[PDB]
Enzyme design. Sequence first.
Site, PDB file in Angstrom:
ATOM      1  CB  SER A  17     -38.054   6.574  -0.456  1.00  0.00           C
ATOM      2  N   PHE A  18     -31.907   0.133   0.965  1.00  0.00           N
ATOM      3  CA  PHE A  18     -31.298   0.739  -0.225  1.00  0.00           C
ATOM      4  C   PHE A  18     -31.082   2.248   0.007  1.00  0.00           C
ATOM      5  N   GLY A  19     -32.054   3.057  -0.402  1.00  0.00           N
ATOM      6  CA  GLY A  19     -31.999   4.495  -0.218  1.00  0.00           C
ATOM      7  C   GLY A  19     -33.097   5.242  -0.935  1.00  0.00           C
ATOM      8  CB  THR A  20     -33.881   8.377  -1.598  1.00  0.00           C
ATOM      9  OG1 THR A  20     -35.029   9.058  -2.085  1.00  0.00           O
ATOM     10  CG2 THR A  20     -32.717   9.331  -1.599  1.00  0.00           C
ATOM     11  CB  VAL A  21     -34.397   7.411  -7.184  1.00  0.00           C
ATOM     12  CG1 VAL A  21     -34.106   7.984  -8.564  1.00  0.00           C
ATOM     13  CG2 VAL A  21     -33.893   5.962  -7.093  1.00  0.00           C
ATOM     14  CE  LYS A  38     -29.145   2.018  -5.187  1.00  0.00           C
ATOM     15  NZ  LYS A  38     -28.874   0.602  -5.549  1.00  0.00           N
ATOM     16  CG  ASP A 123     -33.933  -6.760  -9.464  1.00  0.00           C
ATOM     17  OD1 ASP A 123     -35.029  -7.376  -9.471  1.00  0.00           O
ATOM     18  OD2 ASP A 123     -33.705  -5.781  -8.740  1.00  0.00           O
TER      19      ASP A 123
HETATM   20  C1  LIG Z   1     -38.701   4.355  -7.400  1.00  0.00           C
HETATM   21  N1  LIG Z   1     -39.114   5.449  -8.269  1.00  0.00           N
HETATM   22  C2  LIG Z   1     -38.377   5.841  -9.310  1.00  0.00           C
HETATM   23  O1  LIG Z   1     -37.290   5.349  -9.604  1.00  0.00           O
HETATM   24  C3  LIG Z   1     -38.921   6.983 -10.104  1.00  0.00           C
HETATM   25  N2  LIG Z   1     -40.100   7.531  -9.824  1.00  0.00           N
HETATM   26  N3  LIG Z   1     -40.280   8.521 -10.760  1.00  0.00           N
HETATM   27  C4  LIG Z   1     -41.490   9.330 -10.731  1.00  0.00           C
HETATM   28  C5  LIG Z   1     -39.194   8.658 -11.573  1.00  0.00           C
HETATM   29  C6  LIG Z   1     -38.928   9.532 -12.618  1.00  0.00           C
HETATM   30  C7  LIG Z   1     -37.722   9.411 -13.291  1.00  0.00           C
HETATM   31  C8  LIG Z   1     -36.809   8.409 -12.951  1.00  0.00           C
HETATM   32  N4  LIG Z   1     -35.638   8.345 -13.741  1.00  0.00           N
HETATM   33  C9  LIG Z   1     -34.487   7.611 -13.707  1.00  0.00           C
HETATM   34  N5  LIG Z   1     -33.621   7.839 -14.708  1.00  0.00           N
HETATM   35  C10 LIG Z   1     -32.470   7.141 -14.653  1.00  0.00           C
HETATM   36  C11 LIG Z   1     -32.154   6.232 -13.657  1.00  0.00           C
HETATM   37  C12 LIG Z   1     -33.165   6.078 -12.681  1.00  0.00           C
HETATM   38  N6  LIG Z   1     -33.067   5.072 -11.681  1.00  0.00           N
HETATM   39  C13 LIG Z   1     -34.051   4.625 -10.862  1.00  0.00           C
HETATM   40  C14 LIG Z   1     -33.517   3.552 -10.191  1.00  0.00           C
HETATM   41  N7  LIG Z   1     -34.061   2.766  -9.251  1.00  0.00           N
HETATM   42  C15 LIG Z   1     -35.527   2.724  -9.189  1.00  0.00           C
HETATM   43  C16 LIG Z   1     -36.017   1.734  -8.130  1.00  0.00           C
HETATM   44  C17 LIG Z   1     -36.421   0.441  -8.979  1.00  0.00           C
HETATM   45  N8  LIG Z   1     -36.224   0.785 -10.403  1.00  0.00           N
HETATM   46  C18 LIG Z   1     -36.283   2.255 -10.454  1.00  0.00           C
HETATM   47  C19 LIG Z   1     -32.167   3.450 -10.619  1.00  0.00           C
HETATM   48  C20 LIG Z   1     -31.086   2.504 -10.205  1.00  0.00           C
HETATM   49  N9  LIG Z   1     -31.934   4.326 -11.575  1.00  0.00           N
HETATM   50  N10 LIG Z   1     -34.328   6.747 -12.695  1.00  0.00           N
HETATM   51  C21 LIG Z   1     -37.069   7.552 -11.873  1.00  0.00           C
HETATM   52  C22 LIG Z   1     -38.288   7.658 -11.204  1.00  0.00           C
END
Ligand SMILES: CNC(=O)c1nn(C)c2ccc(Nc3nccc(-n4cc(N[C@@H]5CCNC5)c(C)n4)n3)cc12
Length: 265
Positions: A17, A18-21, A38, A123
Amino acid sequence: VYLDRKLLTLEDKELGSFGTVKKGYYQMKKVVKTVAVKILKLKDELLAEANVMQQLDNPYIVRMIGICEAESWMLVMEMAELGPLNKYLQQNRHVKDKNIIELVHQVSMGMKYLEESNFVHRDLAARNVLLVTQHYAKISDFGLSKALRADENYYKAQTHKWPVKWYAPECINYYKFSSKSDVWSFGVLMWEAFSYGQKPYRGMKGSEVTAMLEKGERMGCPAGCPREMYDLMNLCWTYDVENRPGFAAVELRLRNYYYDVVNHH
Ligand SMILES: CNC(=O)c1nn(C)c2ccc(Nc3nccc(-n4cc(N[C@@H]5CCNC5)c(C)n4)n3)cc12
């Protein structure tokens, strides 16, 4: 591009958690696809982010499935199950040096592709690298990304949130972003990966980081990081944009060192 919300199932708990994933499932032609979504819950920025991803096709870049407009705007992507590279390395401190090289080399292949495609990431950091497996990394977070104009090598930001510790001196001094400025960020990313997800320039203010770099000082070699990899980090941190290597040169140095390490083991 526009997905059918009836075919999307989101999980209640959030990954970040822009927003949340959030984790979800997209009912496809026959198979069900696990997706990372996202959620905005900013709209123009998400659509621009989706537009960049739609144009990219590379094994080391996160693939976008599509966008869906529902209770909030959603960016639906292929799931990279192991999550952010920095968090993974902080939680798995016994990942071998050869494995770290393998992963940072994959990032360099994705970035070589981005540079060839004339897109600047803007980034590039270890928190923005996602793991499919312990041996398979992909670049994510295209929210600040720009398609370079046909007549220019850089994107000029009109007005100065910026991750300053990852930014090259010309980004700070001239607001100019190029593939060479992404090379600088990639040097910081290499330092994070070899430091097992530790934050760069620990305890320093952005202004102190700027002063340090201006004195010609650079971060030290992380524990256990081979000299060849530290030399590459320092080359990415070449102050002058013109003398800094491009991703074709960075990827080749990494590829050669990686296969030297593979064949020595
Ligand atoms: C913040 N926590 C997480 O993202 C996260 N935590 N855990 C435990 C995860 C497990 C799998 C994935 N898997 C995934 N697979 C594909 C795409 C993404 N994405 C994530 C972002 N943003 C996050 C913000 C900055 N970088 C990443 C975007 C734009 N795509 N995530 C993501 C996460």
